[PDB]
Amino acid sequence: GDDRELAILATAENLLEDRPLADISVDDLAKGAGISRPTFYFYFPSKEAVLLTLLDRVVNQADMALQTLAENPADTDRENMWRTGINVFFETFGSHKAVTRAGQAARATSVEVAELWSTFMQKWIAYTAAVIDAERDRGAAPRTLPAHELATALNLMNERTLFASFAGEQPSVPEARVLDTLVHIWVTSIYGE
Amino acid sequence: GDDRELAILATAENLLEDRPLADISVDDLAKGAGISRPTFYFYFPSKEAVLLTLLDRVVNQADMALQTLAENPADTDRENMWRTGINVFFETFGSHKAVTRAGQAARATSVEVAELWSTFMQKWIAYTAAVIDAERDRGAAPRTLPAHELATALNLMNERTLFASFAGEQPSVPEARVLDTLVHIWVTSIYGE
Ligand SMILES: O=C(NCC1CCCC1)C1CCCC1
Ligand SMILES: O=C(NCC1CCCC1)C1CCCC1
- Which three-class secondary structure state does DSSP give residue B91? helix
* Ligand 1 centroid to residue A125 C-alpha, Å: 7
Q: Name the strand (E) or helix (H) holding A167.
A: helix A147-167
Q: Which candidate in A189, A190, A193 is best for mutational testing of the B interface (most B CBs within 10 A)?
A: A189
How many angstroms separate the alpha carbon of residue A121 from the centre of ligand 1?
8
**DSSP category for residue B21:** G
User: Which amino acid does the sequence have at A148?
Assistant: H
Residue spans of the domains in chain A: they are 1-46, 47-193
Give the ligand at the shortest distance from the Cα of A118.
1
C-beta separation of A6 from A41 below 8 A:
no
Q: What are phi and psi of A4, to 5 degrees?
A: -65, -45
Name the nearest CA neighbour of B171 among A187, A120, A170.
A120
State how far the Cα of A92 lies from the Cα of A89, in Å rounded to an integer: 5
Residue window 68-127, chain B: list those with CB within 8 Å of chain A: 105, 108, 118, 121-122, 125
Residue A119 CA, distance from chain mean position: 12
Q: Are A105 and B108 in contact (CB under 8 A)?
A: yes
Give Cα B145 distance to the centre of its chain.
Answer: 26
User: Which amino acid is located at B80 in the chain?
Assistant: N
CA distance A126 to A129: 5
Q: Does A135 touch chain B (CB under 8 A)?
A: no
Classify domain A1-46 by CATH architecture. Orthogonal Bundle (1.10)
Report which ligand 1 atom has the smallest distance to the Cα of A82. Answer: 6
Instruction: Tally Cβ neighbours within 10 Å of residue A58.
Output: 18
In Å, the largest CA–CA distance within chain A is 62
Whether B181 sits inside 8 A of A145 (CB atoms) is yes
Q: What are phi and psi of B5, to 5 degrees?
A: -60, -45
Smallest CA-to-CA distance from B93 within B175, B18, B19 is with B175
CA distances for A182 relative to A59, A165, A187, angstroms: 20, 12, 9
Tell me how far apart the alpha carbons of residues A127 and A132 are, in angstroms, rounded to a whole number.
9
B20 interaction partners in chain A (CB closer than 8 Å): none
Q: What is the CA A138 to chain-centroid distance, rounded? A: 30
Same fold yes or no, A1-46 and A47-193 = no
What are the C-alpha distances in Å from A187 to residues A21, A53, A150, B192?
38, 34, 12, 9
Resolution of the coordinates, Å: 2.0
**CA B63/CA B18 separation, integer angstroms:** 27
CA–centroid distance, residue B124 to ligand 2 (Å) = 6
Report the C-alpha gap between A139 and A159 in whole angstroms. 29
Burial A110-139 (b: 16+ CB within 10 A, else e): beebeebbeebbeebbebbbebbbebeeee
- Angular region, A34: left φ>0, alpha ψ -120 to 50, beta rest: left
Which amino acid, one-letter code, is at A104? Q
CA dist list (Å): A137 to A130, A131, A140, A166, B77: 10, 10, 8, 36, 30
Tell me how far the alpha carbon of residue A182 lies from the centroid of ligand 1, in angstroms. 10
Provide the shortest C-alpha distance from residue A164 to chain B (in Å).
9
Query: Is the omega angle on the peptide bond into residue A171 within 30 degrees of 0, that is, cis?
Result: yes
A138: Cβ contacts below 8 Å, ≥ 6 apart: none
Question: What is the torsional sign of CA A18, B119, A90, A134?
Answer: negative
In sequence order, which ranges of A18-146 are alpha helices (DSSP H)? 26-33, 37-43, 47-71, 78-94, 97-107, 111-137
Distance CA B49, CA B60 (A): 16
**What's the rounded Cα separation, in Å, for the pair A8 and B38?**
48
CB A131 within 8 A of CB A48: no
> What's the CATH fold of domain A47-193?
Tetracycline Repressor; domain 2 (1.10.357)
**A13-19, long-range: CB within 8 Å, 24+ apart, which pairs?**
A13/A54, A13/A96, A13/A98, A13/A99, A16/A51, A16/A54, A16/A98, A16/A99, A16/A101, A16/A102, A17/A98
The answer to whether the CB of A11 falls within 8 A of the CB of A33 is yes
Minimum-distance ligand to the CA of A154? 1
Contact assignment for B185 to A155 by CB distance below 8 Å:
no
Interface check for B177 against chain A (CB to CB < 8 A): the answer is yes
Residues A178, A35: Cα–Cα separation, whole Å: 41
Q: Whose CA is nearest to atom 14 of ligand 1?
A: A155
Alpha-carbon gap, residue B51 to B159, rounded angstroms: 19
Does ligand 1 lie within 6 Å of residue A103's CB atom?
no
Interchain proximity B177–A149, CB inside 8 Å: yes
Q: Are B128 and A171 in contact (CB under 8 A)?
A: no
Sign of the Cα pseudo-torsion (B77, B79, B84, B85, in order) = positive
Q: Which atom of ligand 1 is nearest to the CA of A90?
A: 1
* Gap between the Cα atoms of A47 and A19, Å rounded: 14
User: Ligand 1: does its nearest atom lie under 6 Å from the Cβ of A90?
Assistant: no
Q: How far apart are CA A156 and CA B172, in angstroms?
A: 8
What is the SS3 string spanning B123-153?
Answer: HHHHHHHHHHHHHHHCCCCCCCCCHHHHHHH
Closest CA to B92 of B137, B124, B128: B124
User: Residue B157 burial by CB count (10 A; 0-12/13-18/19+): exposed, middle or buried?
Assistant: buried
Hey, how many other C-beta atoms are within 10 angstroms of the C-beta on A64? 12
Closest ligand to C-alpha of residue A162 is 1
- Asked if residues B160 and A152 have their Cβ atoms less than 8 Å apart, the reply is no
Instruction: Tell me whether residue B18 is exposed, middle or buried, using C-beta atoms within 10 angstroms of its C-beta: 0 to 12, 13 to 18, 19 or more.
Output: exposed
